[PDB]
Every structure is written in structure tokens, then in C-alpha cells.
């Protein structure tokens with residue numbers, strides 16, 4: 288549509304593209320000490336070879352480190368979802384409270400919309416969990432790993 | 436009967452969890468000798484508040500109600516003391532007031548924190564604030580009015596807080612300070628509820644029909660009229676039951692209020708507040724439902740064995756034995772081989 | 775191959791596999807929690823229906 | 825006419841984008857099945 292706010296703001300749900308370009312920041316806010324990674328790998332190897340003498344590096348020493356690293360990203364995804372919900376609520380308020388002079392109507396039309404939004408919060412979080420859970424279920428080395 | 440929101444509060448207490456309902460703070464703002472402090476007494480249902488003509492509410496009182504199976508009160512400044520006779524709670528409030536403000540009609544912004552436990556109360560926060568005045572007396576400083584407003588603004592300018600504007604009936608409504616404050620902080624009327632507290636003392640020949648019908652100063656949520664206990668009745672320790680019966684008789688008899696009789700009095704105010712709170716938690720429930728369902732999903736898979744538990748069940752014992760022996764053999768093999 | 779055969783040979787098979795007190799207390803607490811939790815969801819249901 | 829130059833450009837972008845989609849599908853289909861059909865079966869058996 289027309290009548291865009293060319294001067295005053297960067298706004299009107301274009302903030303959500305910042306979350307989609309801000310979540311790539313949360314995914315790298317996390318850091319680890321390499322010495323703990325090395326210690327954990329050493330113990331993973333020593334714990335995979337239980338009594339046997341090792342000839343080749345076991346493949347579970349890779350898988351059990353990757354799963355442990357992958358479990359860390361559950362939190363920032365939920366933070367992203369909550370931020371998106373916050374922006375939807377703010378947008379509904381702008382489209383409801385500022386343009387309507389009738390009492391009671393601007394309450395029903397905000398309450399109903401934000402209730403529907405919260406229910407979709409529920410469904411969205413379930414789908415995010417069923418995506419990260421899938422990332423753990425299988426290790427795929429076919430597409431872009433360091434091919435020998 | 437108990438309203439459904441109290442049924443939820445009972446169930447949440449009954450499950451020993453920290454999940455709870457998010458309810459607004461309720462502030463009652465009036466004016467000097469308006470009677471605001473006497474309204475909370477009837478709302479809560481226990482005659483523990485200090486009362487009487489003059490400067491009686493000197494410090495803001497923060498009263499928190501908690502749902503519990505034992506009825507009692509506690510103070511933060513009286514640690515470990517379980518009060519069961521509220522007529523000593525009154526004395527502790529007066530003593531704590533005098534300890535800080537002094538006896539010469541002083542005030543202080545520091546609140547008194549009281550917690551009351553009872554079986555069918557929500558987790559509401561109630562604030563009894565000192566009334567506004569124009570003329571300083573009793574060594575109060577010349578700016579007493581501004582300090583009182585400064586105390587009020589820290590409770591009535593917050594969001595998610597209801598404002599009950601208490602105005603007397605015998606004093607012309609245009610002079611009411613509570614309506615001025617509510618108007619300043621709630622221009623739209625979404626949060627303000629008005630109450631007319633002294634219809635008993637109207638000058639003979641007049642009435643307040645033009646106020647209770649929301650015509651003289653239209654307010655979005657209307658006005659509720661009440662009749663409270665007079666100074667003599669409190670000095671005579673008249674039972675709350677008699678006061679409520681007298682109020683009902685007053686409204687039924689008075690020729691100018693019969694058609695409003697079913698919208699007035701303390702219990703109607705209770706119904707209105709319950710409806711406002713009930714409509715305040717809508718659009719919050721989906722989160723509680725999702726958390727409760729998640730816990731049920733994580734318990735239901737296990738409690739199936741418990742529901743049919745019997746002290747004599749050889750099949751349950753046999754299968755438990757087989758599963759534990761299997762788990763032992765597998766755990767030992769994994770632990771020593773490393774597989 | 776043998777462990778279960780030996781377990782069937784121990785004691786009198788009457789006191790073996792007898793629950794401790796702690797499991798009984800946990801059972802009671804879990805059943806109480808289950809029933810109260812279902813009640814809470816019933817009340818939320820009724821409130822949303824009105 | 826210059827319109828043909830626009831059409832060719834769109835085609836190239838579509839092919840590029842579709843390549844990315846193909847990778848995702850190839851990646852997510854194995855992982856999905858392992859999660860829902862094979863690992864639930866092992867957990868059932870054990």
C-alpha cells in the first residue's frame with residue numbers, strides 16, 4: 288500500500304526483519320573455552336574405548352560432542368519467538384488503540400487478537416522443539432563436511 | 436458460591452506449585468474523612484483497619500491477601516508472630532505508625548506491609564493511602580499537600596492497577612479530589628471505578644440520583660453507592676451483619692433509589708471487582724494451560740501403575756523384576772565395554 | 775544367562791520385591807498431584823467456555 | 825525487446841534458489857525419519 292512513513296521511522300513490522308537479522312547475533316553471542324572442549328573430547332574417547340586398545344578414532348567421539356553442542360541453541364530460538372510475539376502485540380496496539388474512539392470495542396478487538404497470538408505461540412514453540420530434536424536424531428556428513 | 440477464579444486459586448494452592456495468576460494491584464484513593472479506609476474493611480470482611488474521624492491513615496498500608504487453610508495475619512516488622520485476633524493487629528498498626536511518624540498528626544511515605552492468610556482469597560495487593568488535604572495542621576509542613584500527592588502518584592500512576600475513587604455524598608461531587616486524580620491518571624476511564632460512601636448523611640430535601648445514574652459527571656464505569664457504619668455504630672461494635680442488613684433496608688426503603696437497589700451496596704461492588712479481575716486474566720490462560728498440560732504429560736505415563744497399585748500383585752512384581760534385571764545387565768555391559 | 779535363575783533361588787520369593795516406604799510416599803504424592811492438576815485444567819476449561 | 829533480458833535473469837535466480845531448497849530437503853528427510861520411525865522403534869523394542 289501507499290502512505291508509507293518515509294521520514295519518521297523504520298517501523299511498522301519492519302522491525303521483525305531485524306529479529307530475523309538479529310537472531311544471527313544471538314547464535315554467536317555464545318562462546319566456549321577450547322580447553323574444556325579438548326578435555327571433554329579426551330574423556331569422550333577414553334570413555335568410548337572402555338577396556339579395548341584403540342586403533343582408530345571412534346565415530347561416537349564426534350557424535351557425542353556434536354549433540355552436546357547442538358543442545359545449547361534451544362534457548363535463543365525461544366527468545367526469538369518471544370520477541371516476535373512482543374512485536375505483534377505492539378503492532379496490534381498501534382492499529383487498535385490509536386484509531387478508535389468507541390469504548391469497549393478497542394478492548395474486544397485487542398483481547399481476541401492477542402489471545403489468538405498466544406495460542407500460536409504455543410504451537411510455534413512445539414514446532415521449534417520438533418526441529419531441534421530432529422537435528423539431534425541423525426548425523427549427516429554427506430553435504431558439506433570436511434570431505435577426506 | 437465461590438467464583439471460578441477462586442476455584443483456580445484453590446487448585447493452584449492445592450498443587451503446591453509456584454504457578455499463579457497475575458492480578459492487578461488495587462488502589463483506593465479518596466480524601467480526608469471521605470471514608471476510603473472503611474471500604475477495604477468491608478471488602479476484605481474483617482474489621483482490623485484503623486478508623487475514625489480525623490487523621491487516622493498516616494502511612495500507606497500495603498495489604499496482601501494469600502489463600503491458605505489457616506486464617507491469620509503477619510507483619511514484616513513482627514517476625515515470626517502469628518496474629519489470630521485482629522483487634523491486636525489494629526494496635527500493632529497504630530503502634531508502628533506512631534513509632535515512625537510521631538503523635539502530632541504526622542505522615543510518612545514508608546509503607547506498613549501486612550499479609551493476611553485466608554482460605555478463599557486471591558493474591559491481590561491492596562493499598563490504603565492517606566487522604567489528601569489542603570490546610571496543614573499539627574506541625575505538618577506547609578507542603579503536606581505535595582508530599583501526599585507524591586505518595587499517591589507512586590501507586591496510581593502505575594500500569595496494571597485499578598483506581599477506586601471514593602467520594603462523599605454530603606459534599607458536592609464537583610469538589611471531589613479522587614475524581615480529579617483519577618481523571619488526571621485515567622483520562623479514558625478504563626481503570627477508574629467511582630463510589631459514593633455517605634448517602635446516609637444527605638441534607639433533607641436532596642438526593643444523589645443524578646450522580647448514581649452517571650449523568651452529572653459521566654464516568655465510563657458508572658458509580659456505586661454504599662452505606663457504611665457510622666462513628667456511633669463502630670463505637671458500639673455493631674456486627675457487620677447488622678450493618679449490611681441496615682444498608683439493604685436503606686436502599687429498599689428510600690423512594691429515590693428503589694429502581695437502582697439491585698446495583699448498589701458492598702456486595703455489588705464485590706461482584707463488579709470480581710468481574711473486572713476475571714476479565715483481566717483472559718488472554719493469559721493459554722500459558723497456564725500449556726504448562727499444566729506439559730506437567731500432566733510428564734506424569735501421566737507413570738501414574739498408570741500407581742492408580743491400580745495393590746499391596747498384593749504378583750504380576751506387577753514379576754514384570755518389575757524382569758525389567759530391572761534386563762536394565763542391570765544392559766547397564767553393566769555398556770559401562771564396562773564402553774558401547 | 776544365569777542371574778535370574780539364581781535370584782529365583784534366594785530367600786522365599788515372598789519378601790523379595792517388596793516396596794520401600796519411600797516409594798509408597800512418592801506414590802501417594804504423585805496421585806495427589808495428578809488429581810489436583812486435572813482439576814485445575816477442568817476449571818480453566820470451564821472459565822474459557824463461560 | 826529488453827523484456828527478454830529480464831526473463832533470462834529471473835530464470836537464473838530461480839535455478840540458484842532451487843538448488844538451496846534441494847539441499848535442505850535432502851538433509852531433512854533422512855534426519856526426520858531417523859527421529860520418528862527408527863529411533864521410536866528401537867526405544868519401543870528396548
Ligand SMILES: Nc1nc2c(ncn2[C@@H]2O[C@H](COP(=O)(O)OP(=O)(O)O)[C@@H](O)[C@H]2O)c(=O)[nH]1
Nearest residue numbers: 468469470471472473487632633662663665666
Ligand atoms: N454515617 C456514615 N458514616 C460514614 C460512612 N462512611 C464513612 N463514615 C464515617 O467517616 C469516617 C471517616 O472515614 P475513615 O473510615 O476514617 O477513612 P478516612 O476516609 O481515611 O477517614 C468513618 O470512620 C466513619 O465514621 C457512611 O456510609 N455513613
Ligand SMILES: [Mg+2]
Nearest residue numbers: 472491492566
Ligand atoms: Mg484513611
